[PDB]
DNA sequence: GTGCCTGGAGACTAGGGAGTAATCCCCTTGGCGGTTAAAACGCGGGGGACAGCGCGTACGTGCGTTTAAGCGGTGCTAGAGCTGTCTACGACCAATTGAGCGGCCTCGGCACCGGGATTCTCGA
DNA sequence: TCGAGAATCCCGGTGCCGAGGCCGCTCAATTGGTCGTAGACAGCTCTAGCACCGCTTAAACGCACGTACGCGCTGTCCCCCGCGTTTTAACCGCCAAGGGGATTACTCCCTAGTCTCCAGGCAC
């Protein structure tokens, strides 16, 4: 019992593309991709905020870090995402 | 009323929010950030899923094997720039015989 | 001898793998003291990891631990 | 024993049915599977913790990451290897030409 | 202009600094192409460091941390 | 050398981790047979590594010249802290609910297995 | 030559193990009143980069001997390689012992918070 995203990562591939299906070892690959990336974002949005005297994680460290880590157009692909959710997200509260 | 439902997110703002306070990162954590954290792996499974489902359908297999995953990230400059450095298991290596010895 | 049990051939698949023509004799010796290099150079800290963690199982997540420490990491086996 | 009884048929479909060195390059990159023999890296890697251990257990999926690990790392080496070659306009390798990747990587 | 800031009897004299003896003439216009791929992220991630900082100067402290998150480590100008 | 501001040092009281009893218990380590695909010994070779020559050219080296360019000054200009002052602002424990895991049951293309129609041999 | 019967090509039936779905559930996700605390703005100064050029000044631009050697051709020479043949241990299945991994938790012991007194530490 552990905290896995498969299920997440079932319910996303069956919007765009439900035809497809999903093996186990390939899956858990995802996962640890995923959470690869997740550990990634966190240590650098924790080295950003303790750099330059703000504790509070807000979404100004995480877009510096998103900014920082990936390539332009995966900068602004994801930037552009992340604006969307939170737009989203501070709207229907 | 959790707080993916507020924003149609599917990954678990809670438990991604819940991991950066008990996870030995920082201290505050606002609540601006697991939404924007939501989005930007929401946008990467998104990215890779579709890469996936076009080297399946390409290679004619309804299902994603670690072969399709590797063809996925190594036949491309940004996932080379993002993850050019790990590997896949069984994913093979890239199929690309030099011009010299052709 | 357990150094000579990735024979000639099993090289020459590998070499075969990377793309190689023609190989010499001379490489067999020098790609198994590489590889016995890198195996203890991943192996020291991968049992340094059960070596702490009061175990004598190798697992696997303290192999990709030690794997994700010295670059180059694996994905499926954990993380 | 009626595993023992489709072990040997199967032994006898795969003995009935499945049983210029340009061909092998284009045949085995589009491979995805592991090329070392197991139980001999198994035994291997048991005498490299031998040097650096007490009776040290061994779970299988660590011996199979370290497996595909380390033959990652050496096609990766072979493959950089393979480019130092031709660009000494040698098609047939050396181990001069695994000495200069071994040296600039560290 | 300030693509040739850089002269072609400087790179000569680093050659001979390093243990380059004959140099080929493609090989300044090479160097400048480089150094141009080679400063662009780090200039940029500094930007970004600035940008985070909310100002117009950039300061050392965020180069450095630039150069560390690049892997190009710099010892003697903060800490 | 001289020095004052302040992190460092430290004991007492709540309050949450440590490793020692305890017991499953699953994975593993060790060995016996077989059989088989892979590893090893050898042998002729030919195609690729390697030494040498032809050459010419382009950089090693030197010289007249410009060409920014460096060292030193100093005002102009505009960007980096720090103390007040106030607002947000993310966490703490608790009732209620939830949604993804433990283990279970259902489909479905792939490979193996049998008939309908066709072709080959003989007989009538 | 007819016809019956045996062989085979193609079409239809069926195991089968992995993908997909599901009931039970149970320690986390949601919301909340509050509460010490981050933090954002602003006077105000102070301090580091920029331009002009006073005054020099080595250094690059570019052209001219000249010969070292990169590229290509020619001959050499031999070493892995295809192939055949013999050996050999890997994989698989199976029998067996048992040993550390995993899970539960309690006194105890070491830490967060607390105030109190003192010796470090860059500036004069």
């Given at each position: 019992?552990?905290?896995?995203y498969?299920?997440?990562?079932?319910?996303?591939?069956?919007?765009?593309?439900?035809?497809?299906?999903?093996?186990?070892?390939?899956?858990?690959?995802?996962?640890?991709?995923?959470?690869?990336?997740?550990?990634?974002?966190?240590?650098?949005?924790?080295?950003?905020?303790?750099?330059?005297?703000?504790?509070?994680?807000?979404?100004?460290?995480?877009?510096?870090?998103?900014?920082?880590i990936?390539?332009?157009?995966?900068?602004?692909h994801?930037?552009?995402?992340?604006?969307?959710?939170?737009?989203?997200?501070?709207?229907?509260? | 009323?959790?707080?993916?439902?507020?924003?149609?997110?599917?990954?678990?703002?809670?438990?991604?929010?819940?991991?950066?306070?008990?996870?030995?990162?920082?201290?505050?954590?606002?609540?601006?950030?697991?939404?924007?954290?939501?989005?930007?792996?929401e946008?990467?499974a998104?990215?890779?899923?579709?890469?996936?489902?076009?080297?399946?359908?390409?290679?004619?297999?309804?299902?994603?094997?670690?072969?399709?995953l590797?063809?996925?990230?190594?036949?491309?400059?940004?996932?080379?720039?993002l993850?050019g450095?790990?590997?896949?298991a069984?994913?093979?290596?890239?199929?690309?015989?030099?011009?010299?010895?052709? | 001898?357990?150094?000579?049990?990735?024979?000639?051939?099993?090289?020459?698949?590998?070499?075969?793998?990377?793309?190689?023509?023609?190989?010499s004799?001379?490489?067999?010796?020098?790609?198994?003291?590489?590889?016995?290099?890198?195996?203890?150079?991943?192996?020291?800290?991968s049992?340094?990891?059960?070596?702490?963690?009061?175990?004598?199982?190798?697992?696997?997540?303290?192999?990709?631990?030690?794997?994700?420490?010295?670059?180059?990491?694996?994905?499926?086996?954990?993380? | 024993?009626?595993?023992?009884?489709?072990?040997?048929?199967?032994?006898?479909?795969?003995?009935?049915?499945?049983?210029?060195?340009?061909?092998?390059?284009?045949?085995?990159?589009?491979?995805?599977?592991?090329?070392?023999?197991?139980?001999?890296?198994?035994?291997?890697?048991?005498?490299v913790?031998?040097?650096?251990?007490?009776?040290?257990?061994?779970?299988?999926?660590?011996?199979?990451?370290?497996?595909?690990?380390?033959?990652?790392?050496?096609?990766?080496?072979?493959?950089?290897?393979?480019?130092?070659?031709?660009?000494?306009?040698?098609?047939?390798?050396?181990?001069?030409d695994?000495?200069?990747?071994?040296?600039?990587?560290?």
């Amino acid at each position: 019992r552990k905290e896995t995203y498969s299920s997440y990562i079932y319910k996303v591939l069956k919007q765009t593309h439900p035809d497809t299906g999903i093996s186990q070892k390939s899956m858990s690959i995802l996962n640890s991709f995923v959470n690869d990336i997740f550990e990634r974002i966190a240590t650098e949005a924790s080295k950003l905020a303790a750099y330059n005297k703000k504790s509070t994680i807000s979404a100004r460290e995480i877009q510096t870090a998103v900014r920082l880590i990936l390539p332009g157009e995966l900068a602004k692909h994801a930037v552009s995402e992340g604006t969307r959710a939170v737009t989203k997200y501070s709207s229907s509260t | 009323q959790s707080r993916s439902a507020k924003a149609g997110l599917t990954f678990p703002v809670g438990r991604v929010h819940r991991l950066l306070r008990r996870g030995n990162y920082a201290q505050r954590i606002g609540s601006g950030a697991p939404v924007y954290l939501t989005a930007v792996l929401e946008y990467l499974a998104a990215e890779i899923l579709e890469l996936a489902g076009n080297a399946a359908r390409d290679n004619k297999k309804t299902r994603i094997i670690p072969r399709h995953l590797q063809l996925a990230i190594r036949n491309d400059d940004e996932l080379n720039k993002l993850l050019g450095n790990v590997t896949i298991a069984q994913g093979g290596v890239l199929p690309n015989i030099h011009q010299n010895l052709l | 001898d357990n150094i000579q049990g990735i024979t000639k051939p099993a090289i020459r698949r590998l070499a075969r793998r990377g793309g190689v023509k023609r190989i010499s004799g001379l490489i067999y010796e020098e790609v198994r003291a590489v590889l016995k290099s890198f195996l203890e150079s991943v192996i020291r800290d991968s049992v340094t990891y059960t070596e702490h963690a009061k175990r004598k199982t190798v697992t696997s997540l303290d192999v990709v631990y030690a794997l994700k420490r010295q670059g180059r990491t694996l994905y499926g086996f954990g993380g | 024993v009626r595993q023992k009884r489709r072990e040997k048929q199967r032994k006898q479909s795969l003995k009935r049915v499945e049983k210029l060195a340009l061909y092998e390059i284009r045949k085995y990159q589009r491979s995805t599977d592991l090329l070392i023999s197991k139980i001999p890296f198994a035994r291997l890697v048991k005498e490299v913790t031998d040097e650096f251990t007490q009776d040290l257990r061994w779970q299988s999926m660590a011996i199979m990451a370290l497996q595909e690990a380390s033959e990652a790392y050496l096609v990766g080496l072979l493959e950089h290897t393979n480019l130092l070659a031709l660009h000494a306009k040698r098609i047939t390798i050396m181990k001069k030409d695994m000495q200069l990747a071994r040296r600039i990587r560290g």
